Amino acid sequence: SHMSTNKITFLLNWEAAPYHIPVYLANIKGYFKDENLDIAILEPSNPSDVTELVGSGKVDMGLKAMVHTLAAKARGFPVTSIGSLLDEPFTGICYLEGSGITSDFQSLKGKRIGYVGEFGKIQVDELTKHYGMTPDDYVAVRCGMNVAKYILEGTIDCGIGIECIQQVELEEALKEQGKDSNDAKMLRIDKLAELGCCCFCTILYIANDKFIAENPQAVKKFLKAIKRATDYMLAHPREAWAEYGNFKPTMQTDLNTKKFQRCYAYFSESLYNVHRDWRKVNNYGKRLDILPENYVPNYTNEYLSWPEP
Amino acid sequence: GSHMSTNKITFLLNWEAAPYHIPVYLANIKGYFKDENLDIAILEPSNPSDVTELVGSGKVDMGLKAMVHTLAAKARGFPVTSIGSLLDEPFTGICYLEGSGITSDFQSLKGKRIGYVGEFGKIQVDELTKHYGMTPDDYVAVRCGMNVAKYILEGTIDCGIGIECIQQVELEEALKEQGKDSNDAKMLRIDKLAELGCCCFCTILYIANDKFIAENPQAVKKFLKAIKRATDYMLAHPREAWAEYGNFKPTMQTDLNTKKFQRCYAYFSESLYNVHRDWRKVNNYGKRLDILPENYVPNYTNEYLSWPEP
Numbered sequence: 001s002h003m004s005t006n007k008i009t010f011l012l013n014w015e016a017a018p019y020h021i022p023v024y025l026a027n028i029k030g031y032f033k034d035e036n037l038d039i040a041i042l043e044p045s046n047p048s049d050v051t052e053l054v055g056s057g058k059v060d061m062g063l064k065a066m067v068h069t070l071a072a073k074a075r076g077f078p079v080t081s082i083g084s085l086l087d088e089p090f091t092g093i094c095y096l097e098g099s100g101i102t103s104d105f106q107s108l109k110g111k112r113i114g115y116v117g118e119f120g121k122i123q124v125d126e127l128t129k130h131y132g133m134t135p136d137d138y139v140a141v142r143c144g145m146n147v148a149k150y151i152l153e154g155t156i157d158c159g160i161g162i163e164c165i166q167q168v169e170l171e172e173a174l175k176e177q178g179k180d181s182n183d184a185k186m187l188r189i190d191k192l193a194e195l196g197c198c199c200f201c202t203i204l205y206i207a208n209d210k211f212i213a214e215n216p217q218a219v220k221k222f223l224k225a226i227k228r229a230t231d232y233m234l235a236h237p238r239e240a241w242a243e244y245g246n247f248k249p250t251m252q253t254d255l256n257t258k259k260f261q262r263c264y265a266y267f268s269e270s271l272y273n274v275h276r277d278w279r280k281v282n283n284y285g286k287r288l289d290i291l292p293e294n295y296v297p298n299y300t301n302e303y304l305s306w307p308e309p
Numbered sequence: 310g311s312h313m314s315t316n317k318i319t320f321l322l323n324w325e326a327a328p329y330h331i332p333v334y335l336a337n338i339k340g341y342f343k344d345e346n347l348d349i350a351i352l353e354p355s356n357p358s359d360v361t362e363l364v365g366s367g368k369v370d371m372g373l374k375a376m377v378h379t380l381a382a383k384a385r386g387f388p389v390t391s392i393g394s395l396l397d398e399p400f401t402g403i404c405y406l407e408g409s410g411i412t413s414d415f416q417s418l419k420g421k422r423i424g425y426v427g428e429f430g431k432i433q434v435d436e437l438t439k440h441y442g443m444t445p446d447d448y449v450a451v452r453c454g455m456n457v458a459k460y461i462l463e464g465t466i467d468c469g470i471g472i473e474c475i476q477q478v479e480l481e482e483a484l485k486e487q488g489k490d491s492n493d494a495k496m497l498r499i500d501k502l503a504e505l506g507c508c509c510f511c512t513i514l515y516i517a518n519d520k521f522i523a524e525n526p527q528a529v530k531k532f533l534k535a536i537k538r539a540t541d542y543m544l545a546h547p548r549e550a551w552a553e554y555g556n557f558k559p560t561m562q563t564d565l566n567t568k569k570f571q572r573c574y575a576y577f578s579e580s581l582y583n584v585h586r587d588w589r590k591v592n593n594y595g596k597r598l599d600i601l602p603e604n605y606v607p608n609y610t611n612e613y614l615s616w617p618e619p
Contacts (some may be wrong), residue, residue, distance in 0.1 A: 003386035041355035076313030
């Protein structure tokens, strides 16, 4: 046979990024150790791997956005959100002024539109019918984690991204070229779809259902440690950020520092799943035909051990 | 029921993404895994010391680790097997900068802060001391993870364990950044110090969980075929291959990483074969370090490789 391992696998939604600070900081400051937890932090090379891995139990826990978490279980990969990390970050179609793309959705006709994995394309395809268009009126291009990079390189004309990550990259890159950073703009997806929030892109703590049912204390203790790191980071951002970069030097760049400052306001303080946000995205998912008509949102706040705000 | 299964096979690197990982990524990028009907989920560790336990316990299917770690994993009850070789015998040693009081003499290490990655580097340095009129208390070992060269440059350690084509290139480039002579980046070779002859103890290997191997022999063979296909292309088209890799992983587009790749290039195993003699020497070394029991048998196999040993 084999020896047992207490290492709990935690798979990020993305390559290591500024908003992952509470996870790494919880490890770095020994908060996991203090809860007698050993967390193996893993980074995906492809974000589209993440929900199948967690859902199948090949990975115990991780992060993903809300729309992905919903779809994972509708697709037969039983994950559950046990908490929130990054709340409603502004999400949209990022573009550069002077490329012919304007605030009119119709300006996207015939454009190459980058998306990350799969769901971004589904979303844009659905939007088209709301603006006298069809999914053939543009070319969707799968870009993984390089949407902003490929916009800058000219290989796509615009692309789906988050304001505090992708738009910051564009802004900083414009500046470096001696261009106006305000040329970096975004058609908000929540505006286009008329939603009211970008809650569909709230980044959540998720876990496999069986892992939850079999390690209820580990889950609760994991969230205590995250909460402690989150409290610390929010009260001492500069010092926490420096701690994070000392461990992951990529975070020590000016570019990631700018991103972190933009991420800062979006961090969930309480880690709570916001009920109204889940209801609204659930309905959005059904509208997108990726969730069945009577689908129940897959989240819980029961492993959080402090008052709901 | 609604619970669906996955076809994804998890593959965990030994380290954050680095130039020598090109054959793994390239096999995916150029569609070689898909051509073999394999869906490989490439994962990157934040902590290299997590890897062998994750593969050994079966939590992760396959991955990479160096020989010493691979032998040690199964000796400790985490059953993995090397199924092929990625990076052959890369020069490994205690890296330092000229002028800091450290010299080719092991005894200059007295009272110094010596960085190591995870666990075994300290074991190795500790054992070395007694051959040089020293004890493990005659230096201060500092656990550094993947940031040994960084911390040498930042001065929070005096020297540390690293491989020539990664850590030493890092010191060389930073020295030029400072207007210094890059030749000031030196190492005390650990193979020389330990009387080994080769740095096969740091040969980086393709490894797999033993149960995964027994239950999926065809997937393993196919994985290695796709790896071999990527490896041939990369060795025959290094510039084009490197550019493909960097287009996917932008960090690989830096001048520093390009110089690391050029230095890694000579070390890539061309046939992926485990070298039997190397395993024998490293087995005995690990027994000597007391990390392997006296009757221990090397945990590797070449039987999933689909072309002859040249």
